[PDB]
C-alpha cells in the first residue's frame, strides 16, 4: 500500500529538481523550513523525530538540500518529510508539508473491533510493521 | 383640574406630531466614537418624501422613537439613547436611490446576543409605508462588542492541525440522490468516495430522519465506512452528520450520539434560527467537535440589489456566533455569484482586519479583535475540467465539494474521487513552479498533460468538456477599478 | 468618495 | 477491465447531462393525491430559458435531482420520490412572469418538523442562476401531515375563557420610549395604563436585558403593577414579559421565572428562529401560559411582489408550530397593508376551512383538521379617531394595540387609556343596533356624540384629527371582483 | 553533527544572557493603544542597578521573558506579546525611588478572570533580588476588557429603590 | 506512585511564558521528558487565552507524555493548570 | 381560471 | 424483561443493553401501556423487540364472542413490536 499523507502523494515520487523548486517557493514567502523522520506512520502520530533545529534565516535552497542528503544516508529505513512554518500574527503554524523518502515496502494496517453497549463498536487501527519489530528495525 | 394645569408646554415635549428630523434623529455634524455600532442602508423614498426625512425615520424607528411626542422621554437620558443619521448620498448612475450612514450607542445592546442586535437593526423598518424599498449593505461592529462573543469553536488553524493537512484546499462531496437511500447504502457511498481520495463527504441539507431512513441507522453505518477507509489509506477521514431537528432537545440528543461514536464533525442548517445556532456553537467548543453551517433559505432575502440583506453582513454575524465552516460561492457553478462580491465575502471570513474597498463592496474599516477565522465552502455544479479557474478565484483556504462531479463518473465512485484529487495536485504543483495556469490555453493543457497518466481523469475531461453556466448576475457592484 | 474614511474616524 | 465492461448504456441512466423535463420532473397528466404537499411559485425566467424547463428545474432541485445523471438512483424507488411540475400559466397583465404548481410525496418529510419542510421547499432554489426572480405565494398542507403538529397551545376560545372577556376586541398598548427606562419606571406605566382600562400592556421587541435595566428587576415590578390594577377594577389583567435571549438555556430560565411569579402570558420574537419557536410552544402547553409572537424581520423577504415569501405562508407555518397570537396588519396605520391581502391573512388564522378566493390571494382549498385558532394582533400608528374603520376591516377576534396613541395623551396615561376604551364600547353598541358606522359621516358623528360625555375622548379627537398615512402599496393582488 | 551545524548564530537568538533592556522590553518611543492595559509601579533599585534596567526587568518577568535567551520565541509573534516599559521618573523629594509606566497587550489575558490578570501583574516580580522594594500604585483598565466582567450585582441606584 | 527513591526529582517550565499554540506546547513536553526530566509544567499565567484554549493544550500534552514514557520505560507527567 | 379547482382534486 | 412494575422492566432492559444483547422479549399479559413504552425505548436504544402473545386465546378462540386475532395484529403493528 502507498501512504497518502502529505500534499503531493497522488503524484509520482518527486525528483531532486522538483523538490528544490518547492523549497524556492516557500523561501520567497519568508517561511522557516525543517526536516523530520519516523518509522511509525499511524495517522494520529503527531510528533515525528526532529533532524537538527529549523533553518530560520537561510535564503538558499542548497542549504536545505544538503541537510536532506545527510539524513538520507544517516537515518534508518522509514519515512522523511519537509515542513514550512509561518510565525505571522493570525497564523503561527505550519503552512506546507510533503513526503520526500519512502521504505521499499509498506504492508499497511488492519482494524480491531471491540463490542460495547447495544450495537456500538470501539475501533483501533493497527500497523503491521510496528507490531512486528522495535524502532530502528521496522523496514 | 390638576391635570389641565400640569400640561407640558415645552416646544419639544408638548403633545402632537413633528418630523423625525426635528425630534433629534438627524445630525450632519455628528462625531463617531470607537464604541459605536454603524450601519449602511440603501433607501428608495416614496414619490414626494424628502431623502433626509426618510433617513431620520429609519434611525428613530430602529432606536427609541414613535409616530407622536411622548413626555416619558424626560425620565431618561434621551440624547444618549437616540440613534443619529449623519450622512446621505445619491447612489451612482441611479435616480431615486440614496446611501445613508447611521450610528448607535453601545449601551443599546445586550452583551453576546445576536437576537437582540437584529431586533433593533431589522425589526420593523423594512415594512414602513413611507419607503418603497430598503437594503442593509454593511455594518461596523466595534472591538468592545466583539469581545462579548465566542467566535469560531475550532477555527481554520486548529482544524488543519486536527486533520494533519497543510498547504492545499480540502476536498469533499455530497451523497446523491438527495432522498430515498437506506442507511446501509449511504455507508457504502461514503466508504467508496473516501477510499478514492476525498477528505470528507456530507449528508444533503434535507436529510434528517424520514420513513425511508431513521438517523441512528445512518450514524452507525457511516462510522464503519470512515474507519475502513482510514485504515486502508493511512489518513484521517470524516463525514458531516446532520443534527438539524424540530426541537432543541432532539438537536442535543443527536449531537451527543455523534460524539459517543467518535465523529470529528457535524453539520446544521440556517433554517434552524439564530438562537439554536448560538447554542450549538457553544456545545461544539465544550465537546471538541467541528461545526459546519449550510445556508438554506439565505437567497429569499440576499438575491436582489433593491431590497433585503447583503450576504457580507450574514458572513459577519455567523463568524461572531462561532461556526467553523460556511458556504460562500463558486463563481463558475450553477448558483449566483459575482467574482468581485465573492472576493469580498472570502476576505470578511479569513482576514484579521478589513480596509475600505468600494469595488469589492467593503464600506467600513474594521478589526476582528483576534477572533478565529471561518473556513469558506465552494459547492454547486462544478467539475475537474474547471480546476484552473477554481484555484485562481477561490484561493487556498477553502473546501471544494463535488457531488454530481464525483458520483456521476461512468467507471464508479472510487474512479470519480481519484480524477478530482489528481487534477488538484497537478494544478497546485504547476502554480508553485510559476506558470500562467489561469490563461485559457495553459490551464487546460496542464490538466490534459496529467490525464496522460490517469485514465479516470481522461474519461471525466471528455465527458464534461463543454459544460458551463453563463447568465447575467442579479447582485452586482456600484463602483469600478 | 474619500470623505467616507474621514467622516467615520 | 471489469469497470469498462460494466458501464450503464441505458438511455436514462448513461452518464451525461440531460434537461430536467426529460429526467421525469414534468408531468402535465399528473393526478394529485389527498396526502400530497402542494406549492405555488411565481417564476421569472432568464432571457432564452423555456418556462417549462424552469418549472422542472425548481421541482428537481427541491426533491432528489442534481446537474448530471447518477446511477445510484437505481438503488431506490426513484419514481415515487421525484417531485412533479404539473401546471404552468402566464401571470395576468404581465410579460415574463408565470405561475407554477408542484406536488411532493408525503414520505419526503419528517413528522412534526418545520426545519425539515423548509429545508426542501426554500433550501437553495432561490439562488439558481437560470431564474432572475422567484416567490413562494401559497401551499396546500394535507390533513395527514397536520396531525403530526401540536397547533396553538391555548387557542382563541380557551384564552377568552381565561380572561372572562367575550363579544368585543381585546385592548392593549406598548411602553414608550422603546429604550432607556428603569424597571421601577416600567412598572409605573403598566400600573397607570391598566388602571385606565387596558386589558394588556407589552415590552418593546428590543427590550431584553441591557445595562439600563436587567430583566429580573422588570419582571418583579410588573407583577406589583398588575395586582394593584386588578384589585382596583375587579378584572383579570396582564403584561407580555419578553423572554427572547441569545441561547436556549437563557430562554428557559426566563420562562420558568415568569411562571413562578404568576404571569398569565409571555412574548417571543421571530428573529429567534423556527427550532427555538417550536420548543417554546411545547413548553407553554405543558405549563399553562399564553404565547405571543412578534414578527421582527418578516419584511426583509415578505414586502416585494417579485421575490421572497408571501406572509400568508408564514401565517400557516406559525399556526402549525402553535403560537397563540401573531401581528397581522392594520390597513390604516403606518406599516404596509393592502385591505384585500390582509383579509386573506385573518381568514388563514381564524377559519376551520379555506375555499379558493383569487381576489384575496387564496389559491388552494384546505381544512385545518381541528387545529385551534390563532388570534391576530393589529399595531402601528393608529388612534381612537379611526375606530369606525378598525371595526369594519379587522373584525371582532383581534387585539387592537395603541402605544403613542395612549402614552402621548396631554392629560396623562390613565386619561389616554380611558379615551380608547370608551370609543370602542360606543362603536360596538351602535353597530349591534344596525347603524352604517363605516359611512364617512355616521362613523365620526358617533364618536363625537360619545365625546360629549367624556373629556379625555374630546381632547384626543381634537389632537389627532387630521392624522393619516396614504401611500401606494408594494404587495397587491393579481385578480379582481 | 546535525545539531552543531544547525546552531542559531543570530545576534538576538544566539544562546547566552543579555540585559532585559536589549531584549526589547524598553521602548521610550512607544505609542499606547486604547485596548492596552497599563500599570504604574514605585520601584526602589538595589545599590548599583540602573533605574531603566530595573523597569525593563519588571516588564519582561511579568510578560514572556526569562533570565537567558530561548529560540522557542521564533515559533510565535514575539514582538506583539512582549510588555513594554515606556517612561521612568524620579519620585519628588526622594532619592532612590522612581515611578515606571508599563503597557500590556489585550490578548495576554483571559476574558472575565481576575485570577489570570493578577497572575501576570503581581505573580513573582515582588520577590526579584535586583530590587529592594516595589509597590503597584495604579492601573488603567480599558473599555474592551471591562465589558467581559459583570460589575455590581445590584448597584447603588437599584439598592436605594 | 512514581517508583522513584533516594534522589531529588527533576523538572522544567515551558518558555516563553506566553504566545505558544497547543501543538507547539506538546512538542516541548515530548522533547524535555524524552531527554530525562521527570516532569514539565505550564507557567503560572497560562490558563485559557486567544492564542491557545485549554482543551487543546490538555489533549496534545497527554500524547507527548505517553510517547516519552513508552520510549524510556519510566512513569512521566506534566502539571496541567 | 376554474380549471385550478378541478386540476387539484 | 417481563416484570411486575414498569421500574423493574426498565432496570432489566438497561442491563441487557449494557452486556451487548441484540434482542429482548416481552409478554402480552403486561398490558397495552407497558408495551407502548417498551417499543419507544427499543427504537431509542437500537434493540430488537419480540412479543409473546400469552393470554390471547382467552378471547380470540370462539367464533361467536370476543376479538378476532387479525385485529390484535393491526394494533400491535401500530404499537411498534418487531
Ligand atoms: O443540494 C445541492 O444542490 C448541493 O448539494 C450541490 O450538490 P451538487 O454538487 O451535485 O451540485 C449544495 O447543497 C449546494 O451547492 C448548496 O448551494 P450553496 O453552496 O450556494 O449554498
Ligand atoms: O415598535 C413599534 O413600532 C410598535 O410597538 C408600534 O408602536 P406604536 O403603537 O407606537 O406605533 C410595534 O412593534 C409595531 O406595530 C410592529 O409592527 P407590526 O405589527 O406590523 O409587525
- Report residue D4 as a C-alpha cell: 469498462
Q: Are D61 and D124 in contact (CB under 8 A)?
A: yes
Q: At D294, which helix (H) or strand (E)? A: strand D290-294
Rounded Cα distance between D138 and G8, Å, is 14
Parallel, antiparallel, or unpaired for β D98-104 and D37-45? antiparallel
Looking at the structure of chain A, the number of domains it has is 1
Whose cell is 352604517? That residue is: D436
Q: Nearest to residue D346, comparing CAs of D156, D208, D206? A: D156
Q: Where are the alpha helices (DSSP H) in D261-362?
A: 274-287, 299-302, 311-321, 339-350
Q: Are D205 and D272 in contact (CB under 8 A)?
A: no
Q: Nearest to residue B107, comparing CAs of B26, B38, B36, B56? A: B36
Q: At what angle do helices F54-72 and F22-35 cross, to 10 degrees?
A: 20
Return the CA Rg of chain F. 13
Give the rounded distance of the alpha carbon of B375 from its chain centre.
Answer: 10
Locate the DSSP E strands across B34-152: 37-45, 84-90, 98-104, 131-140
- D31 by Cβ neighbours in 10 Å (0-12 / 13-18 / 19+) ranks as exposed
Instruction: Show residues of chain A in contact with H46, CB under 8 Å.
Output: 118-119
- Report residue D460 as a C-alpha cell: 384626543
- Report residue D245 as a C-alpha cell: 435571549
Rounded Cα distance between B191 and D150, Å, is 40
Q: What are phi and psi of D183, to 5 degrees?
A: -60, -40
* Elucidation method: cryo-EM
Question: Virtual CA dihedral for A51, A56, A58, A60, nearest 10 degrees?
Answer: 80
- Report residue E39 as a C-alpha cell: 500599570
List residues of A whose CB lies inside 8 A of any H CB.
115-119
Q: Are D477 and D359 in contact (CB under 8 A)?
A: yes
Rounded Cα distance between B64 and B70, Å, is 11
CB within 8 A of E131, min separation 6: which ones?
E43, E44, E45, E46, E49, E54, E57, E58
Q: How far is the CA of D407 from the centre of ligand 2 (A)?
A: 14
Q: Nearest to residue D335, comparing CAs of H17, F79, B125? A: B125
Q: Are D56 and D84 in contact (CB under 8 A)?
A: no
Whose cell is 450622512? That residue is: B87
CA distances from residue B153 to B290, D185, D250 in whole angstroms, order as listed: 7, 41, 20
Whose cell is 522513584? That residue is: F4
- Report residue B464 as a C-alpha cell: 464534461
Parallel, antiparallel, or unpaired for β D308-309 and B366-367? unpaired
Instruction: Show residues of chain B in contact with E144, CB under 8 Å.
Output: 143-144, 147, 369
- Report residue B265 as a C-alpha cell: 464533525
Instruction: Tell if the CB–CB gap between G8 and D31 is shorter than 8 Å.
Output: no
Q: What are phi and psi of B243, to 5 degrees?
A: -110, 5
Rounded Cα distance between D451 and D449, Å, is 5
Instruction: Residue count of chain D, please give it.
Output: 481
- Beta bridge pairs of residue B366: B354
Parallel, antiparallel, or unpaired for β E84-90 and E98-104? antiparallel
Q: Nearest to residue B174, comparing CAs of B374, B281, B327? A: B327
Q: Nearest to residue E107, comparing CAs of B317, F16, B147? A: B147
Rounded Cα distance between D323 and D153, Å, is 7
Q: Nearest to residue D389, comparing CAs of D446, D452, D474, D323? A: D446
CB within 8 A of F75, min separation 6: which ones?
F1, F2, F3, F4, F69
Instruction: Show residues of chain G in contact with D38, CB under 8 Å.
Output: 8
Q: At D254, which helix (H) or strand (E)? A: helix D248-260
Residue E124 known to bind ligand = yes
Q: Are D419 and D381 in contact (CB under 8 A)?
A: no
Ligand nearest to the CA of B293: 1
* Residue among D171, D172, D174 to mutate when testing ligand 2 (max atoms within 8 A of CB): D174
Shortest-distance atom of ligand 2 to CA D378:
19
Q: Nearest to residue D229, comparing CAs of D184, D176, D192? A: D192
Residue B325 CB-half CA count within 13 A: 27
Q: Are D233 and D164 in contact (CB under 8 A)?
A: no
Residue A38 sits in which domain range? 1-139
Whose cell is 353598541? That residue is: D429
Residue B21, number of CB atoms within 10 A of its CB: 19
Residue H52 designated active-site: yes
Q: What is the DSSP string of B269-338?
A: EGGG-HHHHHHHHHHHHHHT-EEEEE-TTTHHHHS-SSSEE-HHHHHHHHHHHT-SEEE---SSSSB---
Catalytic residue chosen out of the listed positions H52, H59, H78, H82: H52
Q: Nearest to residue B420, comparing CAs of B371, B459, B374? A: B459
Interior angle at CA D180, CA D175 and CA D185, nearest 5: 60
- H32 by Cβ neighbours in 10 Å (0-12 / 13-18 / 19+) ranks as exposed
Q: Nearest to residue B326, comparing CAs of B302, B347, B349, B343? A: B349
Q: Where are the alpha helices (DSSP H) in E62-123?
A: 78-81, 114-121
Q: Are E51 and E132 in contact (CB under 8 A)?
A: no
Full strand arrangement of the beta sheet holding A32-38: A49-50, A32-38, A79-86, A93-101
CB within 8 A of D476, min separation 6: which ones?
D305, D338, D341
Q: Are A24 and B433 in contact (CB under 8 A)?
A: no
Q: What is the resolution of this structure in A?
A: 2.0
Instruction: Show residues of chain D in contact with B110, CB under 8 Å.
Output: 208-210, 246
CA distances from residue D433 to D386, D427, D429 in whole angstroms, order as listed: 20, 10, 6
Parallel, antiparallel, or unpaired for β E131-140 and E37-45? antiparallel
Q: Which residues line ligand 1 (CB under 6 A)?
A: B 174, 204-205, 295, 327, 335, 379-381, 402-404; D 66-67, 124, 127
Q: Are D110 and B209 in contact (CB under 8 A)?
A: yes
Q: Where are the alpha helices (DSSP H) in B122-268?
A: 143-146, 156-163, 183-196, 215-233, 248-260
Which sign does the torsion angle of CA D204, D206, D207, D211 carry? negative
- Report residue D194 as a C-alpha cell: 391598566
Q: Which of F67, F70, F72 is the mutation pick for testing A, counting most A CBs within 10 A?
A: F67
Q: Are B58 and B44 in contact (CB under 8 A)?
A: no
- Beta bridge pairs of residue E136: E41
- E64 by Cβ neighbours in 10 Å (0-12 / 13-18 / 19+) ranks as buried
Q: What are phi and psi of D454, to 5 degrees?
A: -150, 100
Parallel, antiparallel, or unpaired for β D375-378 and D325-327? parallel
Instruction: Tell if the CB–CB gap between B228 and A44 is shorter than 8 Å.
Output: no
Instruction: Tell if the CB–CB gap between E147 and B143 is shorter than 8 Å.
Output: no
Our separate counts of H helices and E strands in chain H read 4, 2
- Report residue B117 as a C-alpha cell: 442586535
Rounded Cα distance between A85 and A90, Å, is 13
3-state secondary structure of B6: coil
Rounded Cα distance between B373 and A88, Å, is 14
Q: Which of F13, F18, F35, F53 is the mutation pick for testing E, counting most E CBs within 10 A?
A: F18
Return the CA Rg of chain D. 26
b/e for E103-129, b at 16 or more Cβ within 10 A?
Answer: bbbbbbbbbeeeebbebbbeeebeeee
Rounded Cα distance between D351 and D362, Å, is 13
Amino acid at each position: 500500500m502507498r501512504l497518502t499523507q502529505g500534499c503531493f502523494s497522488f503524484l509520482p515520487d518527486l525528483t531532486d529538481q522538483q523538490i528544490e523548486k518547492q523549497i524556492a517557493y516557500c523561501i520567497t514567502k519568508g517561511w522557516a523550513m525543517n526536516v523530520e523522520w519516523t518509522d511509525d506512520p499511524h495517522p494520529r502520530n503527531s510528533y515525528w523525530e526532529l533532524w537538527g533545529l529549523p533553518l530560520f534565516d537561510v535564503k538558499d535552497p542548497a542549504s536545505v538540500m544538503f541537510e536532506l542528503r545527510e539524513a538520507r544516508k544517516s537515518c534508518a529505513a522509514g519515512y522523511i518529510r519537509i515542513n514550512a512554518f509561518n510565525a505571522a500574527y493570525g497564523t503561527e503554524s505550519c503552512v506546507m508539508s510533503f513526503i520526500v523518502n519512502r521504505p521499499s515496502n509498506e504492508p499497511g494496517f488492519y482494524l480491531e473491533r471491540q463490542e460495547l453497549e447495544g450495537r456500538r463498536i470501539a475501533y483501533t487501527t493497527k500497523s503491521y510493521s510496528v507490531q512486528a519489530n522495535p524502532e530502528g528495525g521496522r523496514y | 383640574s390638576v391635570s389641565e394645569r400640569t400640561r407640558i408646554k415645552s416646544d419639544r415635549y408638548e403633545s402632537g406630531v413633528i418630523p423625525y428630523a426635528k425630534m433629534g434623529y438627524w445630525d450632519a455634524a455628528y462625531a463617531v466614537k470607537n464604541t459605536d455600532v454603524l450601519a449602511l442602508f440603501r433607501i428608495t423614498p416614496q414619490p414626494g418624501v424628502d431623502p433626509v426625512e426618510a433617513a431620520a425615520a429609519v434611525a428613530g424607528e430602529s432606536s427609541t422613537a414613535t409616530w407622536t411626542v411622548v413626555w416619558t422621554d424626560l425620565l431618561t437620558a434621551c440624547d444618549r439613547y437616540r440613534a443619529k443619521a449623519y450622512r446621505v448620498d445619491p447612489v451612482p448612475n441611479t435616480t431615486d436611490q440614496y446611501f445613508a450612514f447611521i450610528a448607535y450607542e453601545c449601551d443599546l445592546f445586550e452583551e453576546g446576543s445576536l437576537a437582540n442586535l437584529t431586533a433593533s437593526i431589522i425589526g420593523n423598518v423594512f415594512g414602513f409605508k413611507a419607503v418603497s424599498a430598503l437594503r442593509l449593505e454593511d455594518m461596523r461592529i466595534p472591538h468592545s462588542y466583539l469581545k462579548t462573543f465566542q467566535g469560531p469553536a475550532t477555527g481554520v488553524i486548529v482544524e488543519r492541525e486536527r486533520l494533519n493537512k497543510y498547504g492545499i484546499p480540502l476536498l469533499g462531496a455530497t451523497v446523491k440522490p438527495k432522498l430515498g437511500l437506506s442507511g446501509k447504502n449511504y455507508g457504502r457511498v461514503v466508504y467508496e468516495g473516501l477510499k478514492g481520495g476525498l477528505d470528507f463527504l456530507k449528508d444533503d441539507e434535507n436529510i434528517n430522519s424520514q420513513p425511508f431512513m431513521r438517523w441512528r441507522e445512518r450514524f452507525l453505518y457511516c462510522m464503519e465506512g470512515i474507519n475502513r477507509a482510514s485504515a486502508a489509506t493511512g489518513e484521517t477521514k470524516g463525514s458531516y452528520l446532520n443534527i438539524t431537528a424540530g426541537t432543541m432537545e432532539e438537536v442535543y440528543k443527536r449531537a451527543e450520539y455523534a460524539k459517543t461514536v467518535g465523529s470529528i464533525v457535524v453539520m446544521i442548517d440556517l433554517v434552524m434560527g439564530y438562537t439554536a445556532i448560538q447554542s450549538a456553537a457553544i456545545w461544539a467548543r465544550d465537546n471538541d467537535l467541528i461545526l459546519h453551517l449550510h445556508r438554506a433559505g439565505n437567497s429569499t432575502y440576499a438575491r436582489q440589489k433593491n431590497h433585503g440583506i447583503n450576504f457580507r453582513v450574514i458572513c459577519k454575524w455567523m463568524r461572531m456566533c462561532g461556526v467553523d465552516h460556511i458556504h460562500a460561492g463558486t463563481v463558475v457553478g450553477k448558483l449566483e455569484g459575482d467574482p468581485l462580491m465573492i472576493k469580498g465575502f472570502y476576505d470578511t471570513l479569513l482576514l484579521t482586519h478589513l480596509n475600505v474597498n468600494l469595488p469589492y463592496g467593503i464600506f467600513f474599516e474594521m478589526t476582528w479583535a483576534s477572533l478565529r477565522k471561518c473556513m469558506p465552502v465552494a459547492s454547486g455544479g462544478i467539475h475537474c475540467g474547471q480546476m484552473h479557474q477554481l484555484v485562481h478565484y477561490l484561493g487556498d483556504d477553502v473546501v471544494l465539494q463535488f457531488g454530481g462531479g464525483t458520483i456521476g463518473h461512468p467507471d464508479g465512485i472510487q474512479a470519480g474521487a481519484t480524477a478530482n484529487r489528481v487534477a488538484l495536485e497537478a494544478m497546485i504543483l504547476a502554480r508553485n513552479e510559476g506558470a500562467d495556469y489561469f490563461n485559457s490555453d495553459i490551464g487546460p493543457q496542464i490538466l490534459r498533460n496529467a490525464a496522460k497518466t490517469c485514465g479516470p481523469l481522461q474519461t471525466a475531461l471528455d465527458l464534461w468538456k463543454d459544460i458551463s453556466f453563463n447568465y447575467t448576475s442579479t447582485d452586482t457592484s456600484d463602483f469600478s477599478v | 468618495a474619500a470623505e467616507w474614511g474621514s467622516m467615520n474616524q
